[model samples]
Target: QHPSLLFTQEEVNEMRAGKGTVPAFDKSLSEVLAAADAAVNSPVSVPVPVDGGGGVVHEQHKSNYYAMFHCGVAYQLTGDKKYAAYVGDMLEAYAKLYPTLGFHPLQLSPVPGRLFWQTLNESVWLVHTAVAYDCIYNTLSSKQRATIEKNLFVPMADFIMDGMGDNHANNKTFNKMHNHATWATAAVGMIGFAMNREDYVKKALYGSDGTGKRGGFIRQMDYLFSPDGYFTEGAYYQRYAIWPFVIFAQCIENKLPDLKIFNYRDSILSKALSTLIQLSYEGEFFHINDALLKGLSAQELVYAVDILYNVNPSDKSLLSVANKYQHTYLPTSGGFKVARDIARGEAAPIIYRSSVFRDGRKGDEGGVAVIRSTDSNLNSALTLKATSHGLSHGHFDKLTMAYYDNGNEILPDYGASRFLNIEAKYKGHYTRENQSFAKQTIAHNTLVVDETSHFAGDIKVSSRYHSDIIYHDFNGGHFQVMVAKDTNAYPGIEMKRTLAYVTTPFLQFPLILDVLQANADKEHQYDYPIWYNGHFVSLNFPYAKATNELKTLGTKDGYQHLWLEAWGQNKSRNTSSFTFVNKDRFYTISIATTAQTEMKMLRLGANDPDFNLRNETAFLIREKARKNHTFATSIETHGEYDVVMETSSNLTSSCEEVKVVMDTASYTVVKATYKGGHSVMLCLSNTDADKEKGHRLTVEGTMYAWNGRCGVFMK
Candidate 1:
């Protein structure tokens, strides 16, 4: 807005006015340079389609935006007349068809737009094309400028703003608190800066009503983050939301320099960007909620990191991750710093440790936990969700968990089960199963009650509930325990789970212990499912063996996606343990069970006639008939899968035994042993979790003592 859309022309020329070019700059600018050469020979071609424009229309709008924006940058960088002419011609094409266009024919619900199915996308077009129009503002003659600005830029800007405008018809997202509104405000704000429509800037900042203070970009910035800068929508949406949040802040910082948007919200804008990097394990974002797993890392991160660096480069961590990905979005001042830093060999890997991010914008509701073990042998990680219903894209799996080892998802949570925007797969829209399966509690690595999802799979109900952090400790080399309690995930049932990554002398890596306590007044069936991505090795429990026939687990709820392969009772000779090997690593899940418990091995894709689901395996440990019970289990990542080479690769398990030696809700005694030469017992003094004190417990025959309320002992 102040200088350019993505960059100032001065910055563009300055970047070109260089001696030696950096890789990231050359990498991104290389495309712009090629686009310039293409601009020389390529005539501005326009494409128009009837039905939502076959996706490419959507893409073409994006292309036109980038083309015109870059060509405009090129015109300023090289003073080439052809580049400016190329942009003018594209604007002419849109100026012709835009007003004639009615609501797009392909879209349903909300408001539709000329370029994309959703007006949210139409706002995106305004952001880009307006910036492109700005690049050539000085080149066009008075007559041409008036025609283009009056016919195209001004009307498009007005239409985009009218979404937020409650006068007559407007999209509901216009005043909403989601990413859609964020995009609209960013687009409208930047366009306002370019158009000298200060009133529109007020509309962008406050409300479309022009003078209102809340429900605008600034209000979004204030409410969308905790004081700790955690994005309420999780990393995926945070990745998208950061773009507009940062870009608009960049515009505000540039146009209205006194606004100090960078320093607004206690520098939370910058903090949010760094938090996004931390939310990831390894290089990919933790697949907690809905995301393509680092899909936004490409452009979204590039733009956000670049702009923030220009505003303040004191934090090298800003450039730390964008360097790892080796990409950039604009030839802005920020891109220059990222390139120069990488050239100076400042590219350090993103080092993420075990951390927790609280849910809700205020960090009051609940949170997600990450437990990690960094070993050269095999880096392992686990993410547990015990937060709020994630906005519109939220999943209903409270206390859901997924794990990664050897760069493979050992415990997998299938992200949104839709091929977004692909035509054949229900036009890339969410399949019906998404409502009944992907987001349900059964679809996650968590417990399901009576075959129904948490809060009965209702957003309204789930939205009213959230799990709480019972306790969390990050004692290095000893253990990392995160306890979460949920009383509303199911009706009348209270659930509390403790996840511990305990380091011991015998095991090559830390062992994962899950202690789930369920207490209710009436009899109920509990299903504990583990959604793992691996080949099933074997099971110790006896079950009705697999059959050639496949059958649906149920008709309603999310169970319809599962096909039961085996059902077995927990035999006295068996301890209900299951094994699988993923990426040459072995893992066994052994549960503390009673004779009433049963086991089931199931596969996805039963009711999935359209192939919308994946061929994934899930192991189920069921407390088939119980009023109150606790499922204490151990997930051991042990041995190696390399034993199939004639000899067994230590097919023997580390989970030697699992027992609930003593039973009491607050003082339950959980003892476990494995191939490791030690027995570990945890005496959960639920109310006395203080490391400052001491405690001891006698579980059956052995005595255990440790620190904190919930204690651990090893021998």
Candidate 2:
């Protein structure tokens, strides 16, 4: 039972026999050996908590568990007493320091830790250390084990669980259905398994009173994930939470299999691993809510890919992804199996196709739409975020979208305006710009009514409502579309956006067609901003620049962070266009402009005195005095920029014109004309979303007819 938490004694024997046999297992063993060697030589350092994230004290404590984990695994694989001694010594160091400590000196988080700035960090530390302790449990003396458990493990678990004096009521982090609770419960449950404490495990699996009535791991499982296995906080958080979820569930499977933890809620744990991978584009997760640029190499997925594959070896898709993480193995029994199988060429090709990941407990809440280009090998994808408010990390940008092509972010989401683990920036916490600019609606590729963010920048109001997915079509062919609308973001204005990625015979790459319709009772200024990456190449219309000085756009509501650089209006042509280059590709955005339309070139860092935000550029198109308006935007990809040869070709867009042929409450239609007079018409049903419904509309002197919610015609 000593090694039963992570792996059995038999499995450890298998590892010892097959020490240098499998290349991947050997590689994993070598990594553990290196870390163990380093830890064995270094003196134990468990300083009193003094600083916030990324500080010396925080980092030392953070590195301790990692070292202990490596050393403990080394002891199991090599039967090395030195590795066990190192782990025991480190745990004793923590045991002596933990009980006497008060709240962290930083005092930054609402749920502060006795050893770290936040309880979340403390829970994560406990999770890793618990596994390490289990790995070396047999090597410890009776007195040493008692001292560590009584002074360190028990105190830490109680502090995270009941020390705050709120068992099931007021502790926001412990009782709530959030990621923090997941980590805390998993930590308690894991340590319980390692120490054979049924009470602790019961409190973790059930509520605080050891009952199934209130907050617990099972309750979190019931509420946090949607039917599609999509975490409520979105992909990046889903990435972070999956570690505790899977690792704890694995412990349960090994220890208490009668509960069927893996099969709970229709085997949600198994489905979650694949869903997390599908929410990414070429390995990078969709940047939504409060997420940094995280990818498949994340340690959570490193454990997940192996653990999930071992549970269901038929899931070759996990192997295909594990092939990417060959260098970063979990050093567990499951990791050994994944490594051994991958070396034998057991990984099959897995295509992450265009799919919809629904939000909320049921599938009622609007979901995030992932539309991928079927013809591209680079996994060009567009993530349309239209889900509910993502709990505490929710942003004001509903119906926001991010685009990637050839592994390059063409239209990027700012994500969070915080530098993770970088001590210099607000102690590695979310900066003021996170709420000032990043969370605002203007920070994303979405519509802003009267320059106000969604729900008027009020989370309480936003939490009460969510965006609605009207319709979507992913035939896995040339055309893929996702249409959604937000009715409660504003008082009277209804913002409906339709995004379609189509591969036409007239162009080299897929074309993006965007149609946004804002219907209001009275005329209100509508602004649509597009945040483009890469260097600017050309513009089809003339613009007025701020030659003498630059001025802030507005007084509040995220406009204060933008510096107005230029403003323009179309001269003779009714369409305006701008072209830029991202990586090796040339990109263009053409807008159907009217006489009342105006464009502004803006850059971030206007009122930023400390430079907390990135100095990214954007283009804002505004329509003044419009009761109801339709914005038709055609995004084109063409040519290539060869950095090696210092040359470029086909630097212009093939979609020469974009025009709104008809605009109404019932139907919104637009025509995009490519070069050589090749044109395509895209029509959307504004009110009726029935797929089988018929529709007819008159554009100019010709009458066009189509069935279902949308239609595309090429001539």
Candidate 3:
């Protein structure tokens, strides 16, 4: 129940007795302190130059606030007047800027400042600043503290609380238990507690009510964290949101240990922390959910572990591992010091337990998984899981799989690329690559209908009709099943996908795509792309390259290219496979699409000369009885392909041999090897009667399903 459980009375006395427990005098701590000081004092304000026009700065507040906190902590730990003076100076500047604020100065590229008054990111900044300012409250003169509290902190808090409405980013505190709300709660709660403003503290701790119901702190925690400890927004956002939840919760526990933040509901916090550590492959975190590229740091993890261990001292698995990773800041030092202690064999015993975590909000609506692992040695840990919509940052890539080998990303997911203010491009938010393009179903190993995005850019439409499908987990791994049924999106079309993760000497799974309904005479195409690691592996069937040309159509009044030609690759391969051996691990991927209608081929910029030429192949399956016969064609790709395809097929009564011409010089004969009700497998080979002349076989048929899947191979 002690606030600083790691350091006992005796330990504190010993440290106090020996030259004071302040870390400022320590050479290593002093170095960190000095760097933080320099960063805060440096006048390198972040904003677009005047000539560059206007731009809104989203994360600058976070930078300034964190700098403030770091300076304050350095001053307190070191007892250095310089650190205090630095805080005082920044506080004064902030006071002046807070009152004169017209618009956030980073939203516009040429005009400078925010046009959209979203309170989410801004609220996060205020929370950090509140903590920073409070840490130096006693360090400041009465007048200085009064100026900061009245002019800056109070107004910002009031705007976030009452002015920002329930749906207005900051005011919608209790709407969804997301990272955005966590920042708001922490800002209000921490500052409220520091100033002894019981009202603000009440809003932060128990929401608006004193009963921990509706809109209180406990409700936020309960909503944000699922019973299984998995965050609602997926792993990526979990990493971002965890810091405030963990750090602020620690403060709450220290001040009101009876609230039992750590031991809440069978100690879910510890499980969440442990799961986060295990989720990483090598040192890099998993890009699950709305997670950013740079995830939890060793410093943050150490702090989290220290707090978790304080509540559950018996669990030392994380502590033992922390030593190897070189984490050394104590909570008092505001870094990874306990990890250093554990590394030095100065920690207690702890066991890493295996457990099944239910998706907190709607376990079924979200994804559920049972992680089975007795070892923390990276590869030994197995994840048998399924995920729901990863929230706003979630991908349309439901039921996809990512694997790791020898602590390296094998079958990988494209994480993210927006470089925060450090880079001139993208301005540090989710890039187009991560949002409009990559996050779309077309960019992932998923199916796309008529080459259109799901929900047609409408979140409400997608959410209202979306279903979780089914998820099953066992000892080895788990399976995820999903289906999207709507006649509106595709007009009499239904799409279903099943993904299974089977852990073995080699990982194997099948994607069964079934489509139904539609006019048989109409031609349609489906495209599939497999982005494996960094390699562009593909299967091209009945080999033919796509050639669509684009021309300048004309531009709108302000836009440059009003009418630009667009083109895409439309080619098919019957079967494809990709296999590679790295550090004794074998990875192979295969794809097959079955269509029971006319398979049509379309190319981007089909009419334009300026547009790049590319072909996309589709299988057309038609029915025999109807004038508009429905054709069913199955296209399978094995190795890898970077684009989606369309497929259809028809039933054949007699088996026949088809000659496939590969470049004029070489050709292959293919025979219908297997025939089903709606699909057929054509066996292909290069050997021909002219073997003496060294004639080779190449597969050529009316259906070009072979162009997409790479060839099969074995290690």
Clashes of each: 6, 0, 128
> Mind giving the per-residue lDDT tens digits that candidate 2 earns over 625-652?
8888888999988897899999978878
Task: Estimate every model's Cα lDDT from 0 to 1.
Answer: 0.76, 0.84, 0.46
Compose the digit string of candidate 1's lDDT tens values, residues 392-482. Answer: 7888889988888887878888877778767899888778878778888888988888988888888898889789876877773477888
Q: How far in Å is the alpha carbon of 97 misplaced in model 3?
A: 5.5
Q: Decide which is better by TM-score, 1 or 2.
A: 2
* RMSD (Å) of each candidate, 1 decimal: 2.8, 2.4, 12.6
Q: List the residue pairs that clash in candidate 1.
A: 543-568, 643-649, 654-674, 688-709, 689-709, 690-709
For each candidate in turn, the TM-score is 0.93, 0.94, 0.64
Residue pairs clashing in model 2 are none
Using TM-score as the measure, name the better of candidate 2 and candidate 3. Answer: 2
Model 3 lDDT per residue over 180-230, tens place = 567667767767766667788778777655666666556766666666677
